[PDB]
Amino acid sequence: RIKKISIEGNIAAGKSTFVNILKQLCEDWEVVPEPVARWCNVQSTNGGNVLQMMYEKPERWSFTFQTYACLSRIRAQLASLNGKLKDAEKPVLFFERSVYSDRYIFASNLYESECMNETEWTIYQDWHDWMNNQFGQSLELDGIIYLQATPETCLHRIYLRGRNEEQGIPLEYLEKLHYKHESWLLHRTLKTNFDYLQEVPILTLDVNEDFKDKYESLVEKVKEFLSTL
Amino acid sequence: RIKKISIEGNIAAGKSTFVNILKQLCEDWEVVPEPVARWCNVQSTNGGNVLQMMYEKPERWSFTFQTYACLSRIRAQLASLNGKLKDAEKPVLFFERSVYSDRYIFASNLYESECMNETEWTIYQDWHDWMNNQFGQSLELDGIIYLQATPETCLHRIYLRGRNEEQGIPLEYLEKLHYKHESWLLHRTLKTNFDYLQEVPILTLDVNEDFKDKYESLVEKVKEFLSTL
Numbered sequence: 001r002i003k004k005i006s007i008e009g010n011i012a013a014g015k016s017t018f019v020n021i022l023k024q025l026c027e028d029w030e031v032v033p034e035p036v037a038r039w040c041n042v043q044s045t046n047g048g049n050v051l052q053m054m055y056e057k058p059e060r061w062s063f064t065f066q067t068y069a070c071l072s073r074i075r076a077q078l079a080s081l082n083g084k085l086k087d088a089e090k091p092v093l094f095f096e097r098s099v100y101s102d103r104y105i106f107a108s109n110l111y112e113s114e115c116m117n118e119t120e121w122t123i124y125q126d127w128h129d130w131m132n133n134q135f136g137q138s139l140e141l142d143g144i145i146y147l148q149a150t151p152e153t154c155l156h157r158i159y160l161r162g163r164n165e166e167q168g169i170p171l172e173y174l175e176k177l178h179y180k181h182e183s184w185l186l187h188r189t190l191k192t193n194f195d196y197l198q199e200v201p202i203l204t205l206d207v208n209e210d211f212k213d214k215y216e217s218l219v220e221k222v223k224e225f226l227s228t229l
Numbered sequence: 230r231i232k233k234i235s236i237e238g239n240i241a242a243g244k245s246t247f248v249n250i251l252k253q254l255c256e257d258w259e260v261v262p263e264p265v266a267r268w269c270n271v272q273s274t275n276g277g278n279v280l281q282m283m284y285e286k287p288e289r290w291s292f293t294f295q296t297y298a299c300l301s302r303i304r305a306q307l308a309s310l311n312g313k314l315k316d317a318e319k320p321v322l323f324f325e326r327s328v329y330s331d332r333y334i335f336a337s338n339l340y341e342s343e344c345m346n347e348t349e350w351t352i353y354q355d356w357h358d359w360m361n362n363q364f365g366q367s368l369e370l371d372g373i374i375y376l377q378a379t380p381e382t383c384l385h386r387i388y389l390r391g392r393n394e395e396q397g398i399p400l401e402y403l404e405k406l407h408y409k410h411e412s413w414l415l416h417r418t419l420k421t422n423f424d425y426l427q428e429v430p431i432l433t434l435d436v437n438e439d440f441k442d443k444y445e446s447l448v449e450k451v452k453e454f455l456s457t458l
């Protein structure tokens with residue numbers, strides 16, 4: 001009943017900027033931001049900052065981070081499905097990233113960079129499979145919007161936002177994440193364990209230009225994509 | 230419908246020995262062993278040994294271990310509830326430990342020994358609360374059997390079994406775990422977040438003497454305890 005659309009993109013590509021203009025185009029649209037605040041101030045439902053711990057020593061903290069990040073995403077996405085959107089006329093829920101980018105882009109890249117060992121990567125995949133088996137269907141996607149930007153543009157945008165934890169991220173790391181996005185969503189050559197994803201419709205939007213000038217043409221392309229689903 | 234009973238006890242107190250004689254006293258009784266094999270050979274559903282990793286460097290690996298241990302226990306306990314025991318006449322399921330000892334004895338002791346930091350302990354408790362909120366009621370206990378033995382007796386029994394990963398465990402560690410068992414199950418002064426546990430019936434059995442001589446009197450006490458539930 002609720003249509004579910006994931007907004008995917010590299011660090012600082014403009015997912016939140018792009019989301020912050022959606023709700024005003026239709027009252028039946030809702031957004032689930034990445035729960036970054038559960039990540040920088042770890043609290044039970046002045047805590048530790050597990051995002052910062054991972055960037056300071058990724059070989060120590062990537063497994064713990066990646067596991068918490070994805071559990072907290074599932075909880076937030078489930079809370080939105082089962083809230084007041086449930087009773088609108090033509091409901092659409094836009095997710096800032098998905099459980100699929102958690103595993104196939106970020107967790108995978110850290111394992112390949114030796115920031116998780118074989119044991120951690122096995123436990124992580126086991127946990128991910130199981131959590132999706134319990135909640136997979138309620139969260140299944142109807143479509144994906146890819147906000148495509150160069151790694152160099154992303155590096156400039158990290159500087160523009162000034163989020164403290166991200167200021168040390170090097171271009172080399174953003175470029176690794178870029179090539180995983182391109183494999184998954186442009187070339188569609190990245191293989192996953194979730195067969196339906198190979199056919200899910202994708203809308204690719206180039207967001208390298210200034211948002212102020214590109215806004216109107218982006219909106220039209222989104223409105224048209226959504227008509228097809 | 231299924232009565233659920235947890236067998237609790239220190240490392241090498243005799244839980245498996247005690248369990249290995251239950252099924253022969255009644256065809257409607259079943260056992261869920263601690264899934265130690267998922268722990269010493271980590272495999273998706275020749276892997277790493279996460280039990281050994283924790284004992285070699287507990288400050289590095291306790292969070293990862295404790296989280297996997299408890300997820301794997303819940304999965305194994307749920308698989309037994311939803312299997313063929315479901316359709317017996319007077320079904321009883323005996324669990325080798327519970328999600329409550331995972332947190333209030335083992336994970337808690339590691340945090341107090343600085344083998345998990347504040348961030349890890351917060352994430353762990355959050356995960357535990359949430360997992361029990363989804364599966365708590367199906368796994369709720371009707372009774373507890375405490376197999377009580379001195380830490381010194383346990384240390385001798387580690388030597389008798391010869392499980393490779395346990396041979397380095399010092400008496401000081403077993404004694405910490407002993408005093409947590411005594412607080413929870415003898416004195417009943419250990420406070421948890423699960424109000425019903427303070428009234429769950431407990432049968433305490435002293436198992437310091439040789440099993441061969443004590444067997445018959447233990448069985449009678451178990452049969453009588455179970456009549457009361």
Ligand SMILES: Nc1ncnc2c1ncn2[C@@H]1O[C@H](COP(=O)(O)OP(=O)(O)O)[C@@H](O)[C@H]1O
Pocket residue numbers: 009010011012013014015016017018157158160161162207208209210211212
């Ligand atoms: N298309 C764009 N043109 C100019 N600035 C942008 C554009 N997209 C994002 N920004 C800016 O770049 C930074 C990162 O944007 P943000 O939406 O926080 O990215 P994300 O949510 O993808 O991490 C912010 O300073 C934001 O104003």
Ligand SMILES: Nc1ncnc2c1ncn2[C@@H]1O[C@H](COP(=O)(O)OP(=O)(O)O)[C@@H](O)[C@H]1O
Pocket residue numbers: 238239240241242243244245246247386387389390391436437438439440441
């Ligand atoms: N009451 C007992 N008397 C003599 N040996 C015991 C007794 N209980 C356990 N054992 C022995 O002690 C070791 C540990 O027993 P086990 O059942 O594996 O403990 P647990 O399951 O609690 O770790 C084994 O060698 C076992 O034969």
Ligand SMILES: Nc1ccn([C@@H]2O[C@H](CO)[C@@H](O)C2(F)F)c(=O)n1
Pocket residue numbers: 011034036066069070101102103106107166
């Ligand atoms: N599975 C995920 C998801 C996101 N992130 C990181 O979270 C920060 C906020 O987007 C960004 O710094 C980030 F995207 F990289 C991550 O490391 N792993």
Ligand SMILES: Nc1ccn([C@@H]2O[C@H](CO)[C@@H](O)C2(F)F)c(=O)n1
Pocket residue numbers: 240263265295298299330331332335336395
């Ligand atoms: N939550 C738990 C449960 C058990 N264990 C450990 O597992 C081994 C097999 O009982 C024993 O070495 C052990 F009991 F200590 C643990 O460290 N934490």
Ligand SMILES: [Mg+2]
Pocket residue numbers: 015016017034096
């Ligand atoms: Mg954002």
Ligand SMILES: [Mg+2]
Pocket residue numbers: 244245246263325
């Ligand atoms: Mg045992």
